[PDB]
């Protein structure tokens, strides 16, 4: 139930532990081009908002 292209729903992920390893392990995603950060290193960095 995602919205239209011009009305992309925006969600702010705050105050939780992230598990990007699960997202990488999924084979459904055909494209996983990460810009500015290596996809492998996503599981050990800390950022905000």
């Amino acid at each position: 139930r995602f919205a239209s292209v011009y009305a992309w729903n925006r969600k702010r992920i705050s105050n939780c532990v992230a598990d990007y390893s699960v997202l990488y392990n999924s084979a459904s995603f055909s494209t996983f081009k990460c810009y500015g950060v290596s996809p492998t290193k996503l599981n050990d960095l800390c950022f905000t908002n």
């Binding site: 990488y24 055909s30 996983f32 290596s38 996809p39 492998t40």
Partner: protein, 49 residues
């Protein structure tokens, strides 16, 4: 010159070319970053896909 011959699935055709992070060959066949060679892909649908 070390000729390497093998077969992968149709979608990928990436061979971990520069350092490609694709996990199809991340557990099967990794190619070094400083690779002074060539990559050739051939269609096999007609010849016993």
């Amino acid at each position: 010159v070390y000729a390497d011959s093998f077969v992968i699935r149709g979608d990928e055709v990436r061979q971990i070319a520069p350092g490609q992070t694709g996990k199809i060959a991340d557990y099967n066949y990794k190619l070094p970053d400083d690779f002074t060679g060539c990559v050739i892909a051939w269609n096999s649908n007609n010849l016993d896909s």
